[PDB]
Design a protein around this ligand. Structure first.
Ligand SMILES: CC(=O)N[C@@H]1[C@@H](O)[C@H](O[C@@H]2O[C@H](CO)[C@@H](O[C@@H]3O[C@H](CO)[C@@H](O[C@@H]4O[C@H](CO)[C@@H](O)[C@H](O)[C@H]4NC(C)=O)[C@H](O)[C@H]3NC(C)=O)[C@H](O)[C@H]2NC(C)=O)[C@@H](CO)O[C@@H]1O
Ligand SMILES: *[C@@H]1O[C@H](CO)[C@@H](O)[C@H](O)[C@H]1NC(C)=O
Length: 361
């Protein structure tokens, strides 16, 4: 069973206890840790922050304690133009230059693979993602001839049906990637003027226009499209999405005024870390969608949709019963990594809980 965990760069800036460094990462926790995100410059893979070389270095020392742990660097990300990627991929002289530069860079900084996080290809780009993936793997294969262990190649694939059809040739890219992580955590958002969960596990016979907006459907669609189970990985979020209520309506369907106020430590409209959530839960109203199997809480005029140990364990049995390759978690630095905000003295509660299901029968 694979356990892919993302660590984000910008998480070093968070203040106080919010601060997170590859340091904090427990080396036996995951099977793969992915550094997010690399930049592209002069058509070549390159660092993003000033001190990335240091952090890459810190993160790859974990391998001293755990020789079986693999690490990957992710290119792309949301704060990276889709457009920029699209430009490098359609012109063969630029794509090749991008391609040729990756093995050397990864080898220098001691990564084991590259993660493609192109969010998201347009309908005109599908043909080009496919070429990118194909040529990239071909280069990785050619580089192994030099007697090194072949680099891994993976991709982050969004989970809304429409998004998938528009830009991903699932049948084609799966033969070339080592694993695909499904971002099953973005099914709702402030962009819809009502309250709703972003990572429901099942459809829940409540509403029926968006029957394609849950992990279960996404996982089946990918399977029908030709991705083998032994390569699909289900994404499980460790943050929650917040919303400012526009009324006193707190139940399903309730109206919204916009995203929720920022967290003391993550400072971002509409997002909360699990550790900020554990604090929020005091004097909050506990609620849970029984059909969909995920919780939400509300207090004053704030309404938060999130995941806890029960939900995340539930998601893990799902992937086990469908025989998927494993689980991916976004992201380690949003979990209770110090282990001192969520009561019980356990660090990485959400992630350990997933591991526990994965590690048994
Ligand atoms: C659920 C989840 O995890 N969501 C994530 C989402 O949060 C990610 O996005 C990011 O948004 C925040 C703002 O909301 C960005 O933070 C800044 O990061 C930059 C560095 O790139 C910092 O600049 C530094 O500030 C210090 C001063 O303290 C200086 O010393 C530095 O030199 C300066 N950098 C320079 C010189 O330019 C800045 O301080 C950070 N401040 C914040 C807002 O905390 C963050 O960059 C941004 N991520 C990206 C890649 O843009 C998103 C990532 O793509 O994924 C999610 O959806
Ligand atoms: C990333 O690369 C682009 C392309 O050169 C460059 O424009 C930018 O300065 C880099 N971004 C950051 C913040 O490092």
């Amino acid at each position: 069973y694979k356990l892919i965990c993302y660590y984000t760069s910008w998480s070093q800036y968070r203040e106080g206890d919010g601060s997170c460094f590859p340091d904090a990462i427990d080396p036996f926790l995951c099977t793969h840790v992915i550094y997010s995100f690399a930049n592209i410059s002069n058509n070549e893979i390159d660092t993003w922050e000033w001190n990335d070389v240091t952090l890459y270095d810190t993160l790859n020392t974990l391998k001293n304690r755990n020789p079986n742990l693999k690490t990957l660097l992710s290119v792309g990300g949301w704060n990276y133009g889709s457009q920029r990627f699209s430009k490098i991929a359609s012109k063969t002289q630029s794509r090749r230059t991008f391609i040729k530069s990756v093995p050397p860079f990864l080898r220098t900084h001691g990564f084991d693979g590259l993660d493609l996080a192109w969010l998201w290809p347009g309908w005109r780009d599908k043909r080009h993602l496919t070429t990118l993936v194909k040529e990239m793997k071909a280069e990785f294969v050619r580089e192994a001839q030099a007697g090194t262990e072949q680099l891994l190649l993976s991709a982050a694939v969004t989970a809304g049906k429409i998004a998938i059809d528009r830009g991903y040739d699932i049948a084609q890219i799966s033969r070339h990637l080592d694993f695909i992580s499904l971002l099953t955590y973005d099914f709702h958002g402030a962009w819809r003027q009502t309250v709703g969960h972003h990572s429901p596990l099942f459809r829940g016979n409540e509403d029926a226009s968006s029957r394609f907006s849950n992990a279960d459907y996404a996982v089946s669609y990918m399977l029908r499209l030709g991705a083998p189970a032994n390569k699909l990985v289900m994404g499980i979020p460790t943050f929650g999405r917040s919303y400012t209520l526009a009324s006193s309506k707190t139940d399903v369907g309730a109206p919204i005024s916009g995203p929720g106020i920022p967290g003391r430590f993550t400072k971002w409209k509409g997002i909360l870390a699990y550790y900020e959530i554990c604090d929020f839960l005091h004097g909050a109203t506990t609620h849970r969608f029984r059909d969909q199997q995920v919780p939400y809480a509300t207090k004053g005029n704030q309404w938060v949709a999130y995941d806890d140990q029960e939900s995340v364990k539930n998601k893990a049995r799902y992937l086990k019963n469908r025989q998927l390759a494993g689980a991916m978690v976004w992201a380690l630095d949003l979990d209770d990594f110090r282990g001192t905000f969520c009561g019980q003295n356990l660090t990485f509660p959400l992630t350990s809980a997933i591991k526990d299901v994965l590690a048994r029968v």
